[PDB]
Structures are given as C-alpha cells and as structure tokens.
C-alpha cells in the first residue's frame, strides 16, 4: 500500500529506537521522582487514541507498579465546573498535538489541585510544557495521516519506559530495550488481517483480555476511522454479560490473542463464541521470542500495516 498511514506505521520501530535512547535520562530521572513521590493513583487525560493509550497505562501501572490507574472525565470540569481532590496523585496528559484547549484546561486543573503532572506529547515546545511538571517527548515526528499509528506506539513505548524506570523491574527493562527489534519483526511478518474477511461486514466486535483488551480499543477505533466499520472492543470476560447475544445473528469477531497470563481465560471465551457461531478472525503475536508485555505492540504494528490495505480494498482512503 502507498498510503501515509502505512508509511508512518512502518517508521514506528525506528522512531521508537530513537525515542528510547533520547528519553533514557528523562525517564530515569522521572522514575526516581515517582519512587519518592509514591503516587496514590494515576489519572490519565486524553482523547481518542490517547485515551486508549491510557487504558494500556491502566493495565501497565496496576500490574507492574500496583498503583490504581484510570481515565479522567473531562466534562466533570469543562461542563459541570468541578475540581477533584488530586493531591498525592499522578496525572498523565496524553496528547499527540498537545495544544487543544480542552487538554490544556484539564492540565491546569490537575496542577491546581496538587497533582504531580506529566505530559506525553509529540511537540515538546507546545505551551502545555509550561503547565505540567515533566514533559516526556514522544519523538514520533509529524503525523500527517488522519489515523494515528506511530504516535500511538510511541505513547506506549514511553509509558513502558516510564514504568521500567519507575518499578526497576529488570525483566521489563529488557522488554523495553527489545521493543524496536520486536516491532521491526512485526513489520516484516506475514499479514494477519486480510480484506477478504471484512467484505460486506458493516459492524463487528474486537475481543481481548488484559493488555490485549487495551489494544482492542485502539483496533476498534482504527476500524471505524479508516474502514468505516462499526467495530466495538470488549473484554472477553465482559462480552458474556449480555453482549454475546449478538452472536445469535451473524457476527464477525476480531480475536486479539496475547500470550500472557490472560491467555487461558481469553481462549476459553473465544471457543465459546466460536461454538455459538461467530466468524472469528485471529490476530496474534508476530514472532516466538517476544516478551509478553511487548507482544500487544507487535500485534498492533502488524495490524496497522494490514488495516491500511483493508481500507484500500474497501474503497476508503485511510489518510
């Protein structure tokens, strides 16, 4: 494919390699601040792909750092005019552009309530840098495609590095170091999502569990954004509590399979909706040696290239 989306997606391994080297000192310093600060919770501020990145941070910081983590509801402030008690907590503002006024207004509120504030932004110069305490630059470069690809993976890579520095888990440190090579391997692997599966498919469900669910939300957003498919992401545990009735009528399901602690639970539910008659399409990791916490990113890196081709086959310009 010759779209901006695919071209930008293919630069993600090398954009991240430069990011991990360039940010090593920044995130090394931040991890010690967090080890001293000992945040009571982490609140994520962002929209769209950045908000989905925050769902990844929830699983990351709760599993790896034991810190309760969640997403802000911007309307609480911008519509209802309320402040939250955020003293003793960490606020992470995620924004590729980093200049939208809604985003800046919530950063000011978070700082005014006593939170330690960090921003993950692609433009380090934007005025958000004057509000927050620490800026971690995404270093993804300009994103010209409508669909975020590299800027999302660079958000995850920054979150993983902050997590590796903060917790100091050496296993997680090696996974972050292996990220560029793992992503490059994903780019070179064979396609998984093929357009023939998605012909005449107006809506579908993306099923995942754990980190795989967090990446499902981003896959679901991309299916909407570049394929005009009404795709909705569910945890495979949550799907059984009502939504599974849609499998009684024809339903396509995109299965996000991650080889981590969640695998056992997740495959049990994939078998169930399969017996119930759903048309499964299986996404999985791209190489055998990939660390479980990094496997979600490689799956997405592969999906980004494959979904660009699916968009073209459906007559949509993903850009």
Ligand X SMILES: N[C@@H](CO)[C@@H](O)[C@H](O)[C@H](O)COP(=O)(O)O
Ligand Y SMILES: CC(=O)N[C@@H]1[C@@H](O)[C@H](O)[C@@H](COP(=O)(O)O)O[C@@H]1O
Inter-residue contact 193 to 281 (CB < 8 Å): yes
67 touches which of ligand Y, ligand X, its own copies, none (CB within 5 to 8 A by kind)? its own copies
State yes or no: residue 106 binds ligand X (CB under 6 A): no
Residues 6+ apart with CB under 8 A from 188: none
User: Which 3 state secondary structure label does DSSP give 123?
Assistant: coil
**Rounded distance between C-alpha atoms, residue 238 and residue 228, angstroms:** 24
Judge whether 172 and 293 are in contact, CB under 8 Å: yes
Binds its own copies by CB under 8 A, chosen from 134, 244, 299, 308:
244
**CA 63 centroid distance within chain:** 16
Q: Give the count of residues interacting with ligand Y (CB under 6 A).
A: 14
Binding pattern to its own copies, positions 178-217, x when CB under 8 A? Answer: ------------------------xx-x---xx--x----
- Check residue 237 for interaction with ligand Y (CB under 6 A): yes
d(CA 207, CA 272): 12
The stretch among 90-98, 176-184, 194-202, 281-289 that binds ligand X (CB under 6 A) is 90-98
DSSP H/E element including 302 = helix 295-313
Please report whether residue 102 would count as binding ligand Y according to CB under 6 A: yes
Applying CB under 6 A, the site for ligand X has a residue count of 16
Among 68, 74, 141, 243, binds ligand Y (CB under 6 A): 74
Counting every residue written for the chain, the total comes to 319
Q: Which residues bind ligand X (CB under 6 A)?
A: 46-50, 95-97, 100, 103, 146-148, 225, 241-242
């Amino acid at each position: 494919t010759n779209t901006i989306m695919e071209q930008e997606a293919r630069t993600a391994p090398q954009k991240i390699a430069e990011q991990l080297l360039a940010n090593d000192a920044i995130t090394e310093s931040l991890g010690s601040v967090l080890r001293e600060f000992k945040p009571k919770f982490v609140m994520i501020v962002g929209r769209g792909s950045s908000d989905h990145a925050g769902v990844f941070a929830k699983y990351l910081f709760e599993i790896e750092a034991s810190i309760p983590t969640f997403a802000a509801a911007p309307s609480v402030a911008s519509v209802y005019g309320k402040t939250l008690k955020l003293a003793g907590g960490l606020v992470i503002v995620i924004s590729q552009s980093g200049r939208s006024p809604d985003i800046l207004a919530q950063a000011r509120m978070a700082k005014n309530a006593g939170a330690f504030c960090v921003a993950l932004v692609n433009d380090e110069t934007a005025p958000i840098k004057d509000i927050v305490d620490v800026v971690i630059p995404l270093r993804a470069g300009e994103e010209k495609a409508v669909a975020a690809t590299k800027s999302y993976l660079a958000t995850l890579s920054a979150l993983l590095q902050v997590a590796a520095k903060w917790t100091q888990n050496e296993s997680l440190v090696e996974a972050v170091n292996s990220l560029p090579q793992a992503l490059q391997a994903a780019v070179d692997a064979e396609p998984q999502l093929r357009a023939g599966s998605l012909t005449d498919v107006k809506n579908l469900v993306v099923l995942g569990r754990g980190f795989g669910y967090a990446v499902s939300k981003e896959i679901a957003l991309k299916l909407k954004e570049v394929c005009a498919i009404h795709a909705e992401a569910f945890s495979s545990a949550e799907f059984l509590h009502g939504p599974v009735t849609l499998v009684e009528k024809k339903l396509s399901i995109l299965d996000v399979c991650i080889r981590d602690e969640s695998y056992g639970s997740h495959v049990e539910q994939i078998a169930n909706v399969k017996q119930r008659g759903a048309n499964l399409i299986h996404l999985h990791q791209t190489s055998a040696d990939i660390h479980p916490r990094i496997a979600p990113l490689a799956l997405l890196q592969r999906f980004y290239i494959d979904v660009a081709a699916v968009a073209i086959a459906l007559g949509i310009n993903p850009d």
